[PDB]
């Protein structure tokens, strides 16, 4: 996986997502974390980059939609960061 893509995604995550997903968890709805088993259980589409990106773009519930707030490169990077963190158990 491109190291600069992940680094970019980490930065986007710190700036925009860690407020509700510190540590890969979820301070708003505790079960629906960014960890692999939670994503597999709760995210529509399961643990895929497409699924992650879809929810980052379009929101869900109290998860804000970001497609009108972040550019496509930031959305791609943060989705790849979250996927990498989850699939590789890096949180």
Closest CB to ligand HEM among residues 2, 15: 15
Contact between 77 and ligand HEM by CB under 6 A: the answer reads: no
> Contact with ligand HEM (CB under 6 A): which of 7, 14, 22, 62?
62
The last residues before gaps in the chain (C-N over 2.5 Å) are none
Chain positions 16 to 45 lying near ligand HEM, rule: CB under 6 A, are: 16-17, 19-21, 26, 28-29, 32-34, 38-39, 42-43
Give the interface with ligand HEM as residue ranges (CB under 6 A): 16-17, 19-21, 26, 28-29, 32-34, 38-39, 42-43, 52, 55-56, 60-64, 66, 78, 82
């Amino acid at each position: 996986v491109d190291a600069e893509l992940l680094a970019d995604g980490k930065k986007v995550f710190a700036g925009n997502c860690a407020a509700c997903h510190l540590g890969g968890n979820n301070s708003v709805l505790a079960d629906k974390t960014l960890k692999k088993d939670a994503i597999e259980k709760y995210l529509e589409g399961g643990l895929t980059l497409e699924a992650i990106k879809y929810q980052v773009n379009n929101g869900k519930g109290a998860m804000p939609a970001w497609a009108d707030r972040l550019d496509e490169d930031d959305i791609e990077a943060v989705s790849n960061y979250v996927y990498d963190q989850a699939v590789n158990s890096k949180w």
